[PDB]
Amino acid sequence: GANKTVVVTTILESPYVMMKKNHEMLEGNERYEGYCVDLAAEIAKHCGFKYKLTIVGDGKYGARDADTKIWNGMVGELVYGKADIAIAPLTITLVREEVIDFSKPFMSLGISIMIKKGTPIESAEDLSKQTEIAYGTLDSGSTKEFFRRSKIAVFDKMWTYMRSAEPSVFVRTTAEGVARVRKSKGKYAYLLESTMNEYIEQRKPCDTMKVGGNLDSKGYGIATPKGSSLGNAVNLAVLKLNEQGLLDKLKNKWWYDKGECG
Amino acid sequence: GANKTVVVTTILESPYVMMKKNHEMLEGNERYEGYCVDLAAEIAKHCGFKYKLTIVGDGKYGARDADTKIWNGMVGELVYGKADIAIAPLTITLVREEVIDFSKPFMSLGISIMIKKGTPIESAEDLSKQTEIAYGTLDSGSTKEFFRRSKIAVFDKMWTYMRSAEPSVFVRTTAEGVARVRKSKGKYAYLLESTMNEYIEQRKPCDTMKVGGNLDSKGYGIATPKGSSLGNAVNLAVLKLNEQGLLDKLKNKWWYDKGECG
Ligand SMILES: N[C@@H](Cn1c(=O)[nH]c(=O)c2cocc21)C(=O)O
Ligand SMILES: N[C@@H](Cn1c(=O)[nH]c(=O)c2cocc21)C(=O)O
Ligand SMILES: [Cl-]
Ligand SMILES: [Cl-]
Ligand SMILES: [Cl-]
Ligand SMILES: [Cl-]
Ligand SMILES: [Li+]
Ligand SMILES: [Li+]
């Protein structure tokens, strides 16, 4: 039948998607800005569709409840037909790949350590061998799931520590994790995706840093419902944008051109 | 119908696939060793297929002749039905994605600069601004195609330099490029994939190094003919192996555990 406007699901997470300061004077997609807003515009331009940015209702990326078998988050919105495409910092994982389609990665990343400057930690092994410096992750998402599911000795030890540490080492949002690092006088380290770690390192008050190698090597992908015709074109668009250098340009724009730490 | 042995196409390129020193005393898949040999075994274990490693007849990765429209290399073997899967350091690119299926990446990489130690070059921009130190790429493959197709000023300038430089700055094999760096007294720099650059930096006589940031960010993928049923399972296997840390283990095994430079 006739073309329809493509429903995009995304999530408010700086610098990927933010409401503009003047959003009340704007309408529709123009209310938002960020890396994923720019990426959505480029994908739509190359694929020739009109689209509407919507914000995922439950604030989650995507996981399946073990009891009800229901998928939540942006993955769920795709699985249940509430959105046509997810354009967000959504990690390509096996369990998600089984239920939705993903483009090839538009950004590479790995789990990483954020410390307050001066914290005597250089690696995941360092954290795992001690408890004076508490450490944790988001309470939902692929970083938490990495530790929960790991059979690698160091990361399994870290997960056992995280589950049993008091007070809770988990946080609900990136902002909460960053604030906790900044306010804990070196006694909290935050495990988060390297992309986000790099972004925060260039934000005032310039008191955090990424330390150590990444713990894994993953990618973010554009997601569509399994079998959706849109998937092929969107994937070719990601590859084209990468080959043209435009994904690198967008990362530089949102991470470094605007950096606040010199 | 009944299960059939899966025909794998690959290419002799160290450390991905090499003939064992004692290969004459061995048969079948046991004649070969390397990262991609180990990876093929893990993929087959997880997917439950038997397979035969074969070596691509024409020694190429995969490109389409502009006049005849015929695909060569491992891509061609898939397109024309001569192999069922390609397991090799095969870069995911747009033009290839249009004709074959690719798994999500099993290895990340970018184009990079190899110098003989002491060469006064730190970046692609450095190379592009001069001619005393000649520089080039393989005469076939995705690294050459990156420069040929680039509309980025620095890389377009480098391509124009490479096409017009005398004597020819192109090489036919990785070994030829490495040898040329080693024998040219600092007057040749080799543009190659970062993975390979890192491998060579750990090989005697320990006289090369990787310099500068990568020029792009790409991945190697396992390839199957478009629409092949094997593609889904193989892709899930790559993701599982990545999530288990086994791809990192294989890279360490073939790059660093065996490193010859300390
Ligand atoms: N990418 C993850 C969600 N996520 C995460 O787990 N850790 C982080 O530090 C993140 C920053 O932005 C999004 C993030 C997923 O897809 O679940
Ligand atoms: N990955 C490339 C082929 N290739 C390449 O172009 N440059 C290199 O330095 C390589 C090392 O191994 C394979 C390589 C393709 O798929 O064409
Ligand atoms: Cl509509
Ligand atoms: Cl282990
Ligand atoms: Cl057979
Ligand atoms: Cl440019
Ligand atoms: Li999928
Ligand atoms: Li494809």
From Swiss-Prot, chains A, B:
Tissues of expression: Detected in forebrain. Detected in dendrites of neuronal cells. Expressed in the pyramidal cell layers of CA1 and CA3 and in the granule cell layer of the dentate gyrus.
Induction: Down-regulated in the pyramidal cell layer of CA1 in the hippocampus by global ischemia.
Subcellular location as annotated: Cell membrane; Postsynaptic cell membrane; Postsynaptic density membrane
Extracellular-side segments: 120-262
UniProt superkingdom: Eukaryota
Residues modified to Phosphoserine: 150, 184
Residues the entry annotates as binding L-glutamate: 89, 91, 96, 142-143, 193
Site (Crucial to convey clamshell closure to channel opening): 121
Bridged cysteine pairs (disulfide): 206-261
PTM entry text: Palmitoylated. Depalmitoylated upon L-glutamate stimulation.
Glycosylation sites noted in the Swiss-Prot or TrEMBL record: 3
Effect of residue 94 to Y: Promotes dimerization. Strongly reduced desensitization
Positions bearing the site annotation: Interaction with the cone snail toxin Con-ikot-ikot: 64, 148, 240
Mutagenesis / variant outcome for changing residue 242 to D: Increases rate of desensitization
Function: Ionotropic glutamate receptor that functions as a ligand-gated cation channel, gated by L-glutamate and glutamatergic agonists such as alpha-amino-3-hydroxy-5-methyl-4-isoxazolepropionic acid (AMPA), quisqualic acid, and kainic acid. L-glutamate acts as an excitatory neurotransmitter at many synapses in the central nervous system and plays an important role in fast excitatory synaptic transmission.
Other comments on record: The postsynaptic actions of L-glutamate are mediated by a variety of receptors that are named according to their selective agonists. This receptor binds AMPA (quisqualate) > L-glutamate > kainate.
Quaternary context: Homotetramer or heterotetramer of pore-forming glutamate receptor subunits. Tetramers may be formed by the dimerization of dimers. May interact with MPP4. Forms a ternary complex with GRIP1 and CSPG4. Interacts with ATAD1 in an ATP-dependent manner. ATAD1-catalyzed ATP hydrolysis disrupts binding to ATAD1 and to GRIP1 and leads to AMPAR complex disassembly. Interacts with GRIP2. Interacts with GRIP1. Interacts with NSF via its C-terminus. Interacts with CACNG2, PICK1 and GRIP2. Interacts with GRIA1 and SYNDIG1. Part of a complex containing GRIA2, NSF and NAPA and/or NAPB.
Domain description: The M4 transmembrane segment mediates tetramerization and is required for cell surface expression.
Recorded family membership: Belongs to the glutamate-gated ion channel (TC 1.A.10.1) family. GRIA2 subfamily.
Protein name according to UniProt: Glutamate receptor 2
Species this protein is from: Rattus norvegicus (Rat)
Organism taxonomic ancestry: Eukaryota, Metazoa, Chordata, Craniata, Vertebrata
Boundaries of the shown chain within the full protein: 413 to 795 of 883
